[PDB]
Each structure stands twice: as C-alpha cells, then as structure tokens.
Design a protein around this motif. Structure first.
Motif, PDB file in Angstrom:
ATOM      1  N   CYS A 108      54.330 -15.389  20.313  1.00 43.27           N
ATOM      2  CA  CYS A 108      54.806 -14.253  20.910  1.00 43.27           C
ATOM      3  C   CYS A 108      56.224 -14.251  21.282  1.00 43.27           C
ATOM      4  N   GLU A 109      56.987 -13.278  21.302  1.00 46.09           N
ATOM      5  CA  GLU A 109      58.444 -13.100  21.385  1.00 46.09           C
ATOM      6  C   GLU A 109      58.895 -11.932  22.057  1.00 46.09           C
ATOM      7  N   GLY A 110      60.070 -11.795  22.605  1.00 44.10           N
ATOM      8  CA  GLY A 110      60.732 -10.664  23.196  1.00 44.10           C
ATOM      9  C   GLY A 110      60.232 -10.485  24.871  1.00 44.10           C
ATOM     10  N   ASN A 111      60.765  -9.215  25.305  1.00 42.46           N
ATOM     11  CA  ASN A 111      60.507  -8.811  26.645  1.00 42.46           C
ATOM     12  C   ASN A 111      60.279  -7.354  26.626  1.00 42.46           C
ATOM     13  N   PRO A 112      59.134  -6.790  26.802  1.00 41.60           N
ATOM     14  CA  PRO A 112      58.001  -7.411  27.047  1.00 41.60           C
ATOM     15  C   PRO A 112      57.656  -8.318  25.802  1.00 41.60           C
ATOM     16  N   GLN A 113      56.697  -9.203  26.028  1.00 42.84           N
ATOM     17  CA  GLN A 113      56.243 -10.038  24.804  1.00 42.84           C
ATOM     18  C   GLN A 113      55.470  -9.186  24.013  1.00 42.84           C
ATOM     19  N   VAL A 114      55.243  -9.415  22.666  1.00 41.52           N
ATOM     20  CA  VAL A 114      54.685  -9.248  21.453  1.00 41.52           C
ATOM     21  C   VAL A 114      54.167 -10.301  20.473  1.00 41.52           C
ATOM     22  N   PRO A 115      53.052 -10.205  19.997  1.00 40.14           N
ATOM     23  CA  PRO A 115      52.680 -11.189  18.828  1.00 40.14           C
ATOM     24  C   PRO A 115      53.638 -11.256  17.604  1.00 40.14           C
ATOM     25  N   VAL A 116      54.216 -12.015  17.269  1.00 34.72           N
ATOM     26  CA  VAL A 116      55.201 -11.922  16.079  1.00 34.72           C
ATOM     27  C   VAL A 116      54.882 -12.904  15.098  1.00 34.72           C
ATOM     28  N   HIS A 117      53.732 -13.826  15.143  1.00 31.87           N
ATOM     29  CA  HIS A 117      53.551 -14.736  14.048  1.00 31.87           C
ATOM     30  C   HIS A 117      52.018 -15.173  14.457  1.00 31.87           C
ATOM     31  N   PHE A 118      51.249 -15.407  13.187  1.00 25.03           N
ATOM     32  CA  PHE A 118      49.987 -16.036  13.369  1.00 25.03           C
ATOM     33  C   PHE A 118      50.221 -17.416  12.753  1.00 25.03           C
ATOM     34  N   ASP A 119      50.009 -18.181  14.131  1.00 29.50           N
ATOM     35  CA  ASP A 119      50.203 -19.716  13.364  1.00 29.50           C
ATOM     36  C   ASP A 119      49.081 -20.515  13.010  1.00 29.50           C
ATOM     37  N   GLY A 120      47.804 -20.231  13.494  1.00 30.26           N
ATOM     38  CA  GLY A 120      46.625 -21.010  12.816  1.00 30.26           C
ATOM     39  C   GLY A 120      45.239 -20.391  13.570  1.00 30.26           C
TER      40      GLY A 120
END
Length: 120
Positions: A108-120
């Motif tokens: 998650c990144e940003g403010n507000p936070q949002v999902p930006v990558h699926f790790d596993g």
C-alpha cells in the motif's frame, strides 16, 4: 503514480461480484482483464472481496515485502489463483485454477493509502 498503480491493481486482482474457482473462470477473466494481450501472464490471483475490505488491509500492522520494504500488509481472503498451462500462446492462453481462502500480501502507498502491488 499511486493512482495509476491502484487502478492497474484493481484491473488485475479485484473481482468482488464472482467466486470464480474454475479453469474456465481463469481463461475468461485473464483475457477480459487484459493480461493475455501480447503474452500469457504466468501466474495471477483474483481477489473475491469488496473493494473496501481490501483497502482496509492497508491499515493493518506493517510487514516485510519480498523486496525489503516495509509497506506490505496481509489479510486472509477468498481468491482464485490462475496458472498458465503452457499448452498455448496468447491470445489463446489456457489456465488451471485453484480456489481457496488464503493469506495474501499486498503493498500500500499514498495518503490516503491504496493497494499498489500484489506481493504474494
């Protein structure tokens, strides 16, 4: 850039309306979501949960991503994992599916936070 990343995340991994769980579901969704455009994406997971249930995973305690950063989070969700069979090439990609409710890891990144990558 987190909005372009958040949008690509939804297109690739989010589908709340369906429960999937079959090869046919993978073959259809992988195509509909544009992941077999030029090449067959080898592996992909679809999350069958509400968008807010997933944005809410960003608020759990921080854990390590596979890359060393500490902006990853985990949650147990219903998913469908699609694995390319290797029989054919785009645009006729064939997948095998596995359904489960399992632990997943997302960045998650940003403010507000949002999902930006699926790790596993």
């Amino acid at each position: 850039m987190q909005d372009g990343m958040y949008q690509r995340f939804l297109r690739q991994h989010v589908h709340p309306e369906e429960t999937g769980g079959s090869d046919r579901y993978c073959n259809l969704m992988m195509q509909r979501r544009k992941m077999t455009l030029y090449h067959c994406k080898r592996f992909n997971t679809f999350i069958h949960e509400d968008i807010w249930n997933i944005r809410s995973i960003c608020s759990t305690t921080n854990i390590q991503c596979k890359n060393g950063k500490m902006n990853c989070h985990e949650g147990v969700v219903k998913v469908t994992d699609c694995r390319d069979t290797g029989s054919s090439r785009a645009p006729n990609c064939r997948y095998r599916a596995i359904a489960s409710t399992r632990r997943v890891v997302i960045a998650c990144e940003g403010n507000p936070q949002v999902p930006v990558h699926f790790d596993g």
